[PDB]
Amino acid sequence: SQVQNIPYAELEVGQKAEYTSSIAERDLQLFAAVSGDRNPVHLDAAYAATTQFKERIAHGMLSGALISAAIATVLPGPGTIYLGQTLRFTRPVKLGDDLKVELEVLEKLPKNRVRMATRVFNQAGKQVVDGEAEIMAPEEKLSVELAELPPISIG
Amino acid sequence: SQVQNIPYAELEVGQKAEYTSSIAERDLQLFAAVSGDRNPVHLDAAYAATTQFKERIAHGMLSGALISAAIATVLPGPGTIYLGQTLRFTRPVKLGDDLKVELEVLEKLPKNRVRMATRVFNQAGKQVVDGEAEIMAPEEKLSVELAELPPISIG
């Protein structure tokens, strides 16, 4: 399929969208690989078993990654420019959690700018991240084929 | 292999550290994989060649991932609790850029709270990200063996 954006003129204050992701081993490994954060509580099950969490946990900033993809692919979607992001990390995310990013349009501002609430909840409905984004929303309507990745093999 | 943290009592206001990374094709693909942001300006060279950028560009939030690793592995390092992060995306990051994360201790506050400047610069010394982290620095000295990444093959 193709992904259609929601340009500035069509956005409304209060408009919401959601973006969901499971927290699997592969997510922990991919985020470590691209961040360089090889702390063993995210990677080494034997190590994590010795910690207070008893199992591996996700990097806090994995939620910033998910938020950015929600904004870029769902609301407003293709053509958006990222100007800023604030994150508050409220609760840890554990291996085997499922996260839901909730976006909400808070304000429409000059120069096609939008303030977007960016919240993340886990499978129990508890908020794990709170924050807000500043973006420049797309001026024109757009339909874009997202790129398919090559196969990525781990282990 | 081994990494020592820098506990709250060891930190001093003005203390700096750095964390560097080159922006390779693999980084674009892995970040897209873990985030879900597969917009083609990040992944498809033929497409990006048709844009103003003339080449692929990195996801803005890739700098957020690198900052988070710098805090978690270099300063204060293992044991740090990530409470908050602000990011202002001041300049696009391109394929083939070298990024330098600069961390600076701005303030030490009660209950092990630290305010940290988190700036990111490209190869030409232009600032590409500005922001500040709020953390709880570790109370005790820890030495940790970082985990190995599993092997990751792409394509």
Side-chain angles (χ1 to χ4, degrees):
Chain A
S1 314
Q2 275 197 342
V3 177
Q4 293 191 3
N5 65 1
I6 312 298
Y8 184 82
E10 308 179 19
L11 290 171
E12 297 180 33
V13 172
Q15 183 164 5
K16 295 185 175 186
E18 294 177 352
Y19 181 75
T20 57
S21 183
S22 53
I23 309 303
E25 178 179 52
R26 204 168 138 95
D27 301 291
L28 270 39
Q29 292 167 327
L30 291 164
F31 193 88
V34 72
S35 66
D37 185 348
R38 290 182 302 121
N39 269 281
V41 77
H42 309 300
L43 290 173
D44 186 326
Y47 179 85
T50 74
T51 74
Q52 65 185 324
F53 308 100
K54 304 296 182 174
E55 61 185 4
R56 284 169 291 181
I57 67 176
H59 309 78
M61 186 58 73
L62 177 62
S63 289
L66 296 175
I67 285 166
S68 68
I71 293 177
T73 67
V74 182
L75 182 73
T80 304
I81 298 182
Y82 212 6
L83 301 175
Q85 173 75 56
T86 304
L87 299 165
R88 299 170 287 276
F89 305 102
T90 309
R91 292 174 173 84
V93 177
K94 301 178 297 202
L95 180 63
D97 285 350
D98 284 282
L99 302 182
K100 173 184 51 180
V101 172
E102 183 192 50
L103 302 181
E104 184 185 342
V105 175
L106 293 178
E107 306 169 40
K108 291 173 60 173
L109 301 165
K111 303 169 196 162
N112 275 356
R113 284 164 51 253
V114 175
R115 175 168 291 110
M116 186 85 50
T118 60
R119 310 161 187 126
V120 186
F121 301 90
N122 64 20
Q123 68 276 6
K126 292 287 181 279
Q127 186 166 8
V128 299
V129 169
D130 193 30
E132 43 278 337
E134 182 189 350
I135 60 178
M136 183 172 313
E139 177 72 81
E140 72 281 4
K141 189 69 170 188
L142 264 165
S143 205
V144 175
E145 183 74 25
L146 297 186
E148 191 179 357
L149 287 166
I152 297 174
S153 301
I154 312 174
Chain B
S1 87
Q2 202 83 5
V3 162
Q4 275 148 26
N5 65 2
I6 299 95
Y8 180 88
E10 188 174 327
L11 296 163
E12 27 200 2
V13 174
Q15 186 172 356
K16 292 175 179 177
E18 80 176 54
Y19 181 79
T20 58
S21 184
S22 197
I23 307 304
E25 180 176 58
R26 277 175 64 94
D27 299 312
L28 278 38
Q29 298 172 312
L30 291 181
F31 190 90
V34 75
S35 66
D37 185 351
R38 294 180 290 111
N39 276 279
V41 79
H42 301 301
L43 296 173
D44 181 329
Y47 171 82
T50 74
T51 73
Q52 37 160 321
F53 303 109
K54 303 290 187 175
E55 65 193 350
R56 287 169 292 175
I57 61 161
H59 308 75
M61 189 53 67
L62 172 60
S63 290
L66 295 171
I67 288 167
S68 78
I71 294 177
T73 67
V74 179
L75 186 77
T80 302
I81 299 170
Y82 209 7
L83 303 177
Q85 176 74 57
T86 64
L87 298 163
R88 291 176 288 277
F89 303 107
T90 59
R91 187 178 174 89
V93 175
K94 318 296 238 302
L95 180 67
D97 286 355
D98 294 305
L99 295 184
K100 171 172 63 77
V101 182
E102 184 184 69
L103 303 176
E104 179 184 342
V105 178
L106 298 180
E107 191 168 22
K108 291 169 58 175
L109 295 155
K111 278 164 178 176
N112 276 11
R113 298 311 196 272
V114 175
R115 286 175 48 236
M116 186 91 48
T118 59
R119 307 174 185 104
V120 183
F121 301 89
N122 64 21
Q123 60 268 25
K126 308 309 180 171
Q127 184 147 13
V128 300
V129 171
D130 193 31
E132 180 179 304
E134 188 192 357
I135 56 181
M136 183 181 316
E139 191 165 14
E140 333 273 14
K141 196 72 168 194
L142 300 174
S143 191
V144 186
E145 182 75 21
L146 293 181
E148 285 178 327
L149 284 172
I152 297 175
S153 302
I154 302 176

